[PDB]
Ligand binder design. Structure first.
Ligand SMILES: CC(=O)N[C@@H]1[C@@H](O[C@@H]2O[C@H](CO)[C@H](O)[C@H](O)[C@H]2O)[C@H](O)[C@@H](CO)O[C@H]1O
Length: 633
């Protein structure tokens, strides 16, 4: 027989290690590792030791490692031994480590993590978690210091029109943290509550309490959550119930997507929303969008804006000057609140009388004038938001291809359309992937999470390390799958109840049941009515992005769709995904039932829920309907 037996090395340091023992990979890579003698092993008695000030980080790392490794790892203060992981914050190391970088020293004093800031220490703990959660508890000795090349590294998460659930957002922030990504542009509606804005409280929205909760989670992970309220285009979710602020074309036809920037009360409405957001986000930035104001049309059909431009910005001014003026006026407004403005690059165009303020960050997604190289010449600050890094649920042109970008030598100076700029440009802030819903029934948010996995590791690698230490994409892919997700995602209880047959009293207005529940690959349920043999769907009501957003919409029974197939089955997507339900357990133990695509919650309608949609249609009192969770708690 082979005599095969676990090696079982003692915990702590050993001067003996084989020379080519694997060093578990990380993402981002930690480039320039200097090898040392021996190796260190996490084992019984290993602790996470730190100062009092680092106690919370030490405790959180010890609990996490206890879960991944099955060894009881406790946090402690005072002296570290060779059996231990030590956390040190040394702010004098700014030159070597900067604001986010860290150094690991693995040797006879144990596994030392050093950062110059709290977030730098927390980012080194992410590499310690990644290295120890891959089935190997012995790490080769040596040392490495690493810091990100670019200051802003992350994603656009567009939680606009449709709702991305807060549980999804919380997983996404844990994943960003794991990959050292520090930037999320969250385009989203914070529920407007004032008399003058409250008729825009249509769904999707997020409550102030929920925003404060995920902003606090983000900030503990070193993530800047930047709100966007896109303007003066893509304003349907805000202007639908405010036609007084909508821009009319020369024939008098109003577009709920366009703010009338010539109407000072419409501009004041936008600023009022900025002041509403100010109390729940902590960032120093405001993103006002500014893409695609005249998509589907042209300024020639809005002569009122040329008249306005001439009055406001002098004879010869054009609608593009009025458009840029509006952005500069919002820049003035947010700067007075201590923020810096950011916009998308596309509407920045050809001005005469007005020039765009240089203190506005330009997030460049669309090779549309200027070219990147022109904007560099003018000294603008630029973030690379190339369409090569887009995903959309419906627009199959936008699916990140990480293999292609890794193998074709894309880097953060490769702007949209392969327009290369110097990747060392001193005002290149970094780069981001962008996650857009578009027609939103083709993919559930859980399928979006499965799909973006590789592209999120790709952007993390190229914005921190800017290197390709894996010979090909497929070599990186093998390591990122071994590294896996961070603990919070592995612990999320996607399907808290077993498949089986259930009584569900909340559904009696639809059927007396009982109901057969089965689970789907993406973490939801189909609910079949054993009386009719049909399945519960949330299928009908007013929609945005082809998803029912109507507050008070009622579910219905429809012929059972096949919920076991993947997102490539696009021809049956809508029947299939309108039949998926997310069940969640309360703190503690009551269950709520949500349509997977809408992320509202089923409830029995009382007639006392207050919402602009309900001013004009209410479900019959006592029937089961969906409502935002805040109207039904
Ligand atoms: C900057 C940008 O990519 N603009 C377009 C995106 O438009 C956004 O669409 C969403 C809903 O999906 C919101 O309405 C948002 O306000 C708009 O900015 C579009 O999603 C993406 C990907 O298809 O490409 C652009 O056309």
């Amino acid at each position: 027989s082979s005599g095969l037996v676990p090696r079982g090395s003692h915990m702590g340091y050993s001067a003996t290690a084989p020379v080519n023992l694997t060093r578990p990979a990380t993402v981002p890579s930690m480039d320039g590792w200097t090898d040392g003698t021996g190796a260190w092993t996490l084992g019984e008695g290993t602790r996470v030791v730190s100062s009092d000030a680092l106690a919370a980080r030490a405790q959180s790392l010890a609990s996490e490692l206890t879960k991944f490794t099955d060894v009881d790892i406790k946090a402690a203060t005072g002296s570290a031994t060779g059996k231990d992981i030590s956390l040190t914050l040394d702010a004098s190391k700014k030159a070597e480590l900067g604001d986010e970088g860290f150094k690991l020293n693995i040797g006879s004093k144990g596994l030392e993590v050093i950062g110059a800031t709290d977030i730098g220490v927390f980012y080194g703990t992410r590499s310690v978690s990644q290295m120890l959660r891959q089935g190997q508890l012995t790490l080769p000795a040596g040392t490495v210091a690493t810091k990100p090349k670019y200051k802003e590294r992350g994603a656009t998460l567009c939680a606009c029109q449709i709702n991305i659930s807060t549980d999804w957002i919380d997983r996404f922030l844990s994943d960003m943290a794991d990959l050292r990504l520090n930037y999320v542009l969250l385009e989203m509606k914070l529920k407007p509550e004032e008399d003058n804005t409250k008729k825009a409280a249509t769904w999707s929205y997020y409550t102030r309490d929920d925003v404060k909760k995920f902003v606090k989670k983000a900030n503990n992970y070193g993530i800047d959550v930047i709100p966007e309220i896109n303007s003066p285009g893509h304003m349907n979710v805000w202007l639908e119930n405010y036609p007084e602020y909508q821009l009319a074309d020369n024939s008098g036809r109003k577009d709920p997507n366009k703010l009338d920037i010539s109407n000072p009360e419409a501009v004041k409405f936008y600023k009022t929303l900025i002041d509403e957001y100010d109390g729940v986000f902590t960032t120093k930035y405001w993103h006002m969008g500014a893409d695609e104001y005249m998509i589907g049309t042209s300024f020639d059909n809005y002569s009122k804006l040329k008249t306005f431009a001439e009055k406001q910005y002098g004879a010869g001014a054009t609608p593009n000057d009025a458009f840029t003026g509006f952005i500069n006026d919002i820049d003035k407004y947010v700067k007075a609140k201590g923020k810096q403005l950011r916009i998308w690059n596309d509407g920045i165009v050809n001005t005469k009388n007005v020039s765009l303020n240089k203190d506005i960050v330009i997030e460049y997604w669309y090779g549309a004038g200027r070219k990147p190289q022109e904007l560099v010449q003018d000294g603008y600050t630029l973030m690379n938001a190339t369409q090569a890094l887009y995903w959309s649920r419906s627009a199959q042109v936008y699916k990140v291809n990480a293999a292609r970008l890794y193998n074709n030598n894309w880097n953060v100076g490769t702007f949209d359309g392969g327009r290369q700029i110097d990747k060392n440009y001193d005002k290149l802030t970094g780069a981001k992937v962008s996650i857009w819903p578009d027609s939103s029934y083709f993919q559930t948010e859980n399928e979006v999470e499965k799909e973006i996995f590789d592209g999120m590791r790709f952007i993390s690698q190229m914005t921190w390390s800017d290197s390709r230490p894996w010979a090909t994409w497929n070599d990186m892919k093998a390591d990122i799958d071994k590294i896996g997700y961070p603990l919070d995602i592995r612990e999320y209880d996607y399907t808290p109840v077993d498949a089986g047959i259930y009584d569900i009293p909340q559904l009696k207005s639809i059927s007396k049941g009982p109901w057969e529940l089965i689970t789907t690959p993406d973490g939801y349920y189909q609910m079949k009515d054993t009386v009719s043999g049909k399945c519960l769907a949330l299928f009908t009501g007013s929609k945005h992005l082809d998803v029912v957003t109507q507050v008070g919409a009622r579910p219905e029974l429809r012929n059972c769709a096949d919920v076991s197939v993947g997102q490539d089955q696009r021809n049956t997507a809508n029947e299939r995904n309108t039949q998926k339900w997310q069940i969640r357990a309360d703190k503690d133990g009551k269950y709520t039932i949500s349509p997977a695509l809408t992320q509202q919650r089923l409830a029995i309608a009382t007639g006392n829920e207050q919402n602009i949609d309900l001013e004009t249609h209410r479900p019959a009192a006592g029937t089961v309907a969906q409502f935002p969770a805040d109207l039904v708690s």
